[PDB]
Design a protein around this ligand. Structure first.
Ligand SMILES: Nc1ncnc2c1ncn2[C@@H]1O[C@H](COP(=O)(O)OP(=O)(O)O)[C@@H](O)[C@H]1O
Ligand SMILES: [Ca+2]
Ligand SMILES: [Ca+2]
Lengths: 337, 269
């Protein structure tokens, strides 16, 4: 059980990894209903498949904008990696393709909206409410890491709630396959591991760092390190000194210390017992890791749906027209897409 | 609340690490080293990384009235003032204003060294002046390169350690990640006989003299000592002292175990 399946996931991934899916569909197979988010750069749309009438989320990427911002390698990763993984909490890539002006990733719709939006509206999360989400990330990061893949962008803006109250990890722009050590300074400021900031070179450890941050934010309503100007946020992250609000159950704050540890020789997930240190922690006692995986647990919150194609849980952006030029742009750079 | 504003991702130029020297006077250099002492990205730097970076800094001249940087103008550049006077000002709306001042001291732009960040104000030379500039890609190469040269290989030393030969690569890098550095002066005592054996060492540069209570060894670059702290904590039979100026790799042995369990388990397999 717990034994072979591992290998099967790597067997599976690897095979899909070495020969990725290519121009599954095309633009005219879809109706474009509403913007869900302004990607950089960027624009995620709700789309209605025609032959099926079913809905999706389309990630439109301006090929030129990507080149000007130097996100060639990252973009190929996002897509290559995303069409090769499979796990209950990773969003599914249904079709991918490209045209003269844009790249397109079409995905399953997650009607529930961003964690971020709920959290902010709701103020903060009860601990079992926080814990329920945090369990999925832990399991997800174990899946990813086992394949030698780091995610590098954990934040409530990249975590969407699905119709069953569960989570779908979402923005794979910074995800990457690292066997030794990697150096790119990227992520989101409030969430950057100190080794990233100080260009120490780094791998799996930064995700677990970010996990500590997420959790502290899910329960606090604000992240551990914040400040007016960014450099001060970094200053704080490097000291790794953190206050916990009065209401953090002792066990929570204990887990947060082991994860929010600047000293890699003491940071949970990174030690001899790897992840189990986190699962068999003290703040996950009530968690049945097997159940959560089978999505058999009661969600402490179900987003309100209406019919399919409902966007109520999302914000409203101004709709500009998606231009597809008559001249192919940046053809060579995305050949592999 | 500003509670609902989302927090964008940030991302600098990649450099997979797998010639620049701008002359400056001895003093100009010291003043530069002091203006960066307490800047986040410089605080914690090899004095050689620091030296390499202080080489990289280019000279930038300015006649009075000249714009050093323009608000919203690109900030892939950090700047530290050498000489001159300087007004800072912001077009807050709407309204152009002066905020503070610069008198032959002061710096700005550091966040530029991490990712693209458009200057928040326009700085203007209120006299003839000079600055040192540093651009992100340059600065990051220096520091990425320098650490990769200090990662693989920091290892070889480690994989030349008999007690560790049977480590996996994923594990040895774990140690490369955290192994500390120590610097020693002539005759300074590295290890004390009969002291708790808390960690092992490896000489990066210099010479260490092992002695007992009588020279019983001399270690040069690439060679380890105290390496018994891995198998047993029983008190050092000998002592160590520095011959010249030594830099040592020091690995607390407990930390080692938090990462890998007991070294002896390794030396089975
Ligand atoms: N499949 C999807 N379903 C619903 N919303 C999505 C989906 N994919 C992205 N979004 C929304 O669009 C925005 C862009 O997603 P992301 O992948 O982070 O792009 P970027 O990293 O360029 O912002 C996010 O804030 C997210 O809320
Ligand atoms: Ca995002
Ligand atoms: Ca992104």
């Amino acid at each position: 059980s717990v034994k072979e399946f591992l290998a099967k996931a790597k067997e599976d991934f690897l095979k899909k990894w070495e020969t990725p899916s290519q121009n599954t569909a095309q633009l005219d197979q879809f109706d474009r209903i509403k913007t869900l988010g302004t990607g950089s750069f960027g624009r995620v749309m709700l789309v209605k498949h025609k032959e099926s009438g079913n809905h999706y989320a389309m990630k439109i990427l301006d090929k030129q904008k990507v080149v000007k911002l130097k996100q060639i390698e990252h973009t190929l990763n996002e897509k290559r990696i995303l069409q090769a993984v499979n796990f209950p909490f990773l969003v599914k890539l249904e079709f991918s393709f490209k045209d003269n002006s844009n790249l397109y990733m079409v995905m399953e719709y997650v009607a529930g909206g961003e964690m971020f939006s709920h959290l902010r509206r709701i103020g903060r999360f009860s601990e079992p409410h926080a814990r329920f989400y945090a369990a999925q990330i832990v399991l997800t990061f174990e899946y990813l890491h086992s394949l030698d893949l780091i995610y590098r962008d954990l934040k409530p803006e990249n975590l969407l709630i699905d119709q069953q109250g569960y989570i779908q990890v979402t923005d794979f722009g910074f995800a990457k396959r690292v066997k030794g050590r990697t150096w790119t300074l990227c992520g989101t400021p409030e969430y950057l591991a100190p080794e990233i900031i100080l260009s120490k070179g780094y791998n799996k450890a930064v995700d677990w760092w970010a996990l500590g941050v997420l959790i502290y934010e899910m329960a606090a309503g604000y992240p551990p390190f914040f400040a007016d100007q960014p450099i001060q946020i970094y200053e704080k992250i490097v000291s790794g000194k953190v206050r916990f609000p009065s209401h953090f159950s002792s066990d929570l704050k204990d887990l947060l210390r082991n994860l929010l540890q600047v000293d890699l020789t003491k940071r949970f997930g990174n030690l001899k017992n790897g992840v189990n240190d986190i699962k068999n922690h003290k703040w996950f006692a009530t968690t049945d890791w097997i159940a959560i995986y089978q999505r058999k647990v009661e969600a402490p919150f179900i987003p309100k749906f209406k019919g399919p194609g409902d966007t109520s849980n999302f914000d409203d952006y101004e709709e500009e027209e998606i231009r597809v030029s008559i001249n192919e742009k940046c053809g060579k750079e995305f050949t592999e897409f | 609340i500003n509670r609902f504003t989302r927090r964008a991702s940030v991302c600098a130029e990649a450099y997979n690490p797998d010639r620049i020297i701008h002359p400056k006077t001895d003093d100009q250099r010291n003043r530069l080293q002091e203006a960066c002492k307490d800047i986040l990205l410089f605080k914690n730097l090899d004095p050689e990384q620091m030296s390499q970076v202080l080489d990289a800094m280019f000279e930038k001249l300015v006649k009075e009235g000249e714009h050093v940087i323009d608000q919203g103008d690109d900030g892939d550049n950090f700047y530290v003032i050498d000489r001159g006077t300087f007004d800072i000002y912001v077009k807050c709306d709407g309204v152009g204003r002066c905020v503070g001042n610069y008198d032959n001291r002061g710096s700005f732009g550091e966040l530029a060294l991490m990712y693209n960040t458009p200057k928040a104000a326009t700085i203007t030379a209120t006299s003839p002046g000079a600055l040192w500039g540093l651009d992100r890609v340059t600065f990051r190469r220096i520091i990425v390169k320098n650490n990769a040269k200090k990662r693989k290989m920091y290892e070889s030393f480690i994989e030349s350690l008999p007690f560790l030969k049977s480590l996996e690569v994923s594990e040895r890098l774990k140690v490369v990640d955290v192994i500390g550095t120590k610097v020693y002066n002539d005759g300074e005592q590295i290890i004390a006989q009969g002291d708790l054996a808390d960690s092992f060492f490896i000489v990066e540069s210099g010479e260490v003299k092992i002695t007992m209570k009588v020279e019983i060894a001399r270690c040069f670059r690439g060679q380890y000592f105290g390496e018994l702290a891995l198998v047993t904590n029983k008190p050092r039979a000998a002592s160590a002292h520095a011959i010249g100026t030594v830099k040592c790799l020091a690995m607390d042995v407990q930390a080692f175990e938090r990462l890998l369990g007991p070294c002896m388990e390794i030396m089975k397999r």
